[PDB]
Structures are given as C-alpha cells and as structure tokens.
Design a protein around this ligand. Structure first.
Ligand SMILES: *N1=C2C(=O)[N]C(=O)N=C2N([C][C]([O])[C]([O])[C]([O])[C]OP([O])(=O)OP([O])(=O)O[C][C]2O[C](N3[C]=NC4=C3N=[C]N=C4[N])[C]([O])[C]2[O])C2=[C]C([C])=C([C])[C]=C21
Ligand SMILES: O=c1nc2n(C[C@@H](O)[C@H](O)[C@@H](O)CO)c3cc(O)ccc3cc-2c(=O)[nH]1
Ligand code: SF4
Length: 501
C-alpha cells in the first residue's frame, strides 16, 4: 500500500501525490498528524494552533468526500510515534512526502525510524521551483527584488499588454503607494468567520492544553477552509483592493487591518495557491474593480516579495538563521510578550497581535522590527517571537523577513539598506504619536520618544560598518553634524531606556 503523509502547511488539493496516485486511490492511504511535541517548540499563538489543526481536520474530510481513505491522528505525542505506528499498522511500503517548505523540517522527517521507505516529491506549492530560483539567482552576488519581480511578470504573463509591455505604462507603481493616512477615513472591515463544529472542538482542545502559549484564544474569526479563504479573498478584491495602494504604508490608531487582505495565513497553509490569487487579482482589474496602481501593488507582494522569500530561504545557506551582522544580543523586553508598554505605536501592535495574531506589513517592519534593530535586540529572539505570535508564520517567511528585511542581520544580502528609523517616520506615516505620552520631536529626557535616542545611538555605534556599505551617506552626514558631547548625551539617553524597559 502506498502512504501519503500530508503536512499541516500542505493543505492543497493539488498536492502532487494526489495527482499521481489518483488512478491508485483504492491502494493508497493518506495520513495527517497533529503533534504536541511540534507545538511545544514555540509558545504559539492559541489561534495558530486553532487555525492549523482546524484547517487540517477540514482538509482531511474534504479528501474523504472525494474517495480517499484518510487517517487522521488527533493530538499525537510526536510525529515519530504517530507515523511509525500507522506505517506498521497498514503495512505501508512507500511513504510519499512533499518536500517541506521549511527546510529544517526535512531533518525531522528523514530522521524518523519507520518500516516504510521514504519517497520525496517536489514542492510545487509556489510559483518558482527551488531549482529555477537557484538558476536565476546563481549568476549574481547581489540580488534585487525588483528584477526578480519583473522576471515573474514575464514568466507568468502577469498584467501585460498584447505587446508584452506592463499595463499602465510602467512596471512598478510603488512610489504612488506611500500616502500617509487620511484623517477620519474609515477602513472597510475585515472578513470574519464564525467557527463551525470542527473548529469549536479544536478551540476546546487548545483551551485545555498544558503548553505555554500566547495570546487570546477567542474570538477566533479566521477562515479555516478553502471555501472561506476564497471568500475572504473575494471580499478583499471587491471592497478593499480599490484603495490598497494609497494607504499601503499607513498606520492608524484603533485600526488593526486597514485595506489589507489578511489571506497570508490561508496562503501559507496551502488553502490558496499564489497563482490563483494573482489571476483573480488581474481579473478584478479587467472587471474595473481597482486602479492599476493598487492592482499591481497587491500582485507584487505575492509574485515578488512572497516568492522572493521562499526562494531565499532555500537559496541561502542553511546557517542563515545565525546571521547577526550588528552583533546584537539584548533579550526582548517582556513587553513583547505582555504588551505592557506606554510606547503607543508598540502598544497598538502588541494589542492586535495578542487579539488576532496579526499585524500588517508596515507595523512588522517600521514599528516592530525597526524598534528591535535600533534597540540592539537579539535577532534570533525577535525572529522567534514573530514566529510564535503571527498566524502566517513559518521559517521560510520569518527567517527571511526578520533577519533580511527587518533587522539587516545578514548585512544586506536581502535588502538594500537598513530600514531603521527615528520617530520622524512613525509620526509622518501614522497618527500614533498624537495619542502617545512621549514626544516624537524630543530626543533627551523622560518625555522623549525612545526611538530617537535609540536610532541616533544606533548610528553612532555602527557608524563604521554603515559607512563602508555606502548606501547611508546622507543619514551619516547628519550623524556627523553631532559633536561628541551631543552623541555622549544621546548614548546616555539610549542607555537609560534600555535599562528601564
Ligand atoms: N512575518 C511574516 C509571516 O510570518 N508570514 C507572512 O506571510 N509574512 C510575513 N511578513 C511579510 C508581510 O508583512 C505579511 O505577509 C503581511 O503582513 C500579511 O498580511 P496580509 O494582509 O495578508 O498582507 P497584504 O494584503 O498586505 O499583502 C498581500 C500578500 O502578499 C504577501 N506578502 C506581502 N509582503 C510580503 C509577503 N510575503 C512575504 N514577504 C513579504 N515581505 C502575503 O502573502 C500577503 O498575503 C513579515 C514581514 C516583516 C517585515 C516581518 C518583520 C515579519 C514578517
Ligand atoms: O503536520 C503538522 N504540521 C504542523 N505545522 C506545520 C508543518 O507543516 C511544519 O511546521 C512545517 O515546518 C513544514 O514546512 C505546524 C506549524 C506551526 O507553526 C505550529 C504548529 C504546527 C503543528 C503541526 C502539526 O501538528 N502537524
Ligand atoms: S512618540 Fe515614539 S513611541 Fe510614542 S508613538 Fe510616536 S513613535 Fe511611537
């Protein structure tokens, strides 16, 4: 008998084993396993475990409804235990497994001691294959997102005219997609879904776990099935896509979701495929649902950024997780876990992450990662915290986004420059500072925004290495205007916030 073991982020009906064994349906058995040892590796958001395990159970029933014999092992101790016993029990001869998106997971699988032999199949959940990405990247020492993205537009024939020119007269509309927030404008609402019976049962199961976990269990409103995921997507496309562009980087107090799609957790489980998402987004444009700038804007986040991160996770060395270019080693402040800070920008983020396991991109980069970079925090710790707390989190996307984009911990392999910034950025692109007890225009004293002393001490401390990269000339000239007495005072100020967190 052939076995297929399907993993919790591979919930796709186009799993390759399901396409090849489709003639051999009566001689195949499908396994899915929930592993408590796996969940114990991080203090996971309660909604992450709810989401993943409810999506798994729903997917298993979907597969049965199509004729497949599916054995589901609930709340197992270990993959070793569950998988070995199932293999033994059903005399499985060949265990087909799709290459995990998270490369560290491969070691787990291939270390299992099993009566079956292992037959690896290629991951075909993303647009670019690992081999294709590697071939594209190999010729260059320095990679660039923009070029990769254009190559994507061509290979998948995305938003092109009949003569192969980019629709709207240019490849990239991002310059237009950085307006600050407009006073009084109310975002449209997030898609919400009431848990069904399966989901409810998992909520109860998570509720009673003894593992240390994070954040609120309820209300859980996330899509857990393909059909809900498609609904979420369709609603984003018909309501929000029309203004995704303008306020892409905007942050507003009290507004957790804004004009974002919130499909990443569903995409990252396999319930949606990146191409389908892109094709629907184009169709939306050809149905007059949104301007091209927002249309292209959205697509670039999947065709570009998302593909890029998956590719780099497998292209980079497997030691990339230890990148620490700045030699930062400070522990996270407890406020990352409790949310108890009076830095309003941070508090707002932590509040929504606690409540729904989600912050939007510009929060992740310009509030959270930015803070972690200028505060000198251990990159591994930050990365782990993001991985525990966000419902779209996996190694492939979090190693790259945190260590590459947010923290420049790889020294600029992924990004052009550090995204570090003082309160000038946050006050301009948000309304958070208005409701804050700190002043974004002060640098010293008890009422100064701590971002200011930290950013300027950050520059001072790494002045030499930043100088040698040579993309921060203008910013470093600013540092260079500060006398040694002024930078001493900034350092004392930074030292004070660090001790007071
Ligand atoms: N950590 C994560 C993570 O765990 N999972 C994840 O999918 N993405 C992370 N990012 C990148 C983005 O911040 C994140 O995808 C968005 O916040 C997800 O929310 P939403 O509302 O689904 O996103 P959207 O509508 O604005 O965008 C549409 C889709 O585009 C993809 N996308 C966009 N930008 C991306 C990306 N995928 C990978 N990488 C990047 N940079 C999504 O699939 C989305 O559905 C992340 C970024 C940063 C800066 C940190 C520090 C940590 C994480
Ligand atoms: O097959 C499973 N996959 C689970 N996954 C996802 C797997 O696909 C695996 O973590 C990936 O590393 C493989 O790409 C989880 C991911 C999390 O972030 C948190 C908890 C889980 C739990 C499971 C699980 O119980 N079973
Ligand atoms: S003042 Fe500083 S801490 Fe307070 S909100 Fe603005 S940036 Fe965030």
């Amino acid at each position: 008998t052939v076995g297929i073991w399907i993993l919790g982020d591979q919930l796709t009906l186009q799993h390759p084993a399901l396409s090849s064994r489709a003639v051999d349906q009566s001689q195949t058995r499908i396994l899915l396993v929930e592993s408590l040892e796996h969940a114990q590796r991080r203090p996971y958001h309660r909604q992450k475990l709810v989401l993943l395990w409810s999506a798994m159970r729903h997917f298993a029933d979907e597969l049965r409804s199509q004729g497949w014999t599916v054995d589901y092992v609930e709340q197992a101790d270990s993959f070793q235990t569950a998988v070995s016993a199932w293999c033994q029990q059903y005399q499985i001869a060949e265990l087909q497994v799709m290459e995990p998106a998270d490369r560290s997971f491969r070691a787990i699988i291939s270390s299992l001691e099993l009566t079956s032999s292992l037959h690896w199949l290629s991951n075909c959940q993303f647009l670019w294959s690992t081999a294709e990405f590697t071939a594209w990247a190999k010729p260059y020492r320095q990679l660039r997102l923009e070029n990769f993205y254009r190559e994507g537009r061509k290979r998948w024939q995305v938003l092109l005219t009949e003569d192969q020119e980019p629709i709207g007269g240019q490849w990239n509309f991002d310059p237009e997609n950085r307006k600050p927030p407009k006073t009084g404008l109310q975002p449209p609402p997030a898609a919400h879904f009431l848990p069904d019976a399966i989901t409810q049962t998992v909520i109860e199961t998570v509720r009673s776990l003894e593992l240390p976990l994070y954040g609120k269990l309820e209300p859980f409103h996330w899509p857990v099935t393909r059909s809900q995921a498609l609904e979420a997507l369709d609603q984003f496309l018909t309501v929000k896509l029309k203004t995704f562009g303008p306020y892409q980087d905007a942050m507003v107090s009290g507004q957790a979701t804004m004009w974002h799609s919130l499909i990443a957790p569903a995409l990252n489980l396999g319930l949606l495929h990146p191409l389908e998402v892109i094709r629907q987004t184009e169709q939306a444009f050809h149905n007059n649902q949104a301007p091209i700038a927002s249309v292209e804007g959205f697509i670039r986040q999947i065709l570009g950024w998302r593909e890029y991160m998956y590719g780099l996770h497998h292209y980079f060395p497997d030691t990339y997780g230890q990148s620490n270019w700045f030699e930062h080693d400070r522990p996270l402040p407890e406020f990352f876990w409790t949310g108890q800070t009076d830095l309003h920008c941070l508090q707002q983020c932590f509040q929504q992450i606690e409540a729904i396991g989600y912050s939007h991109h510009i929060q992740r980069l310009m509030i959270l990662a930015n803070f972690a970079l200028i505060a000198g925090l251990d990159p591994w710790a930050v990365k782990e915290w993001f991985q525990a707390t966000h419902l779209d989190a996996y190694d492939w996307v979090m190693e790259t986004n945190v260590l590459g984009m947010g923290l420049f911990a790889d020294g600029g392999k992924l990004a052009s420059k550090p995204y570090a910034a003082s309160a000038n950025y946050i006050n301009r692109m948000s309304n958070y500072c208005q409701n804050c007890r700190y002043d974004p225009k002060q640098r010293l004293g008890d009422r100064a925004c701590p971002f200011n002393a930290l950013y300027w001490d950050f520059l001072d401390r790494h002045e030499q290495k930043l100088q040698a990269q040579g993309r921060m000339g203008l910013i470093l000239k600013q540092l260079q205007k500060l006398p040694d007495s002024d930078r001493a005072a900034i350092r004392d100020q930074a030292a004070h916030w660090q001790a007071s967190w």
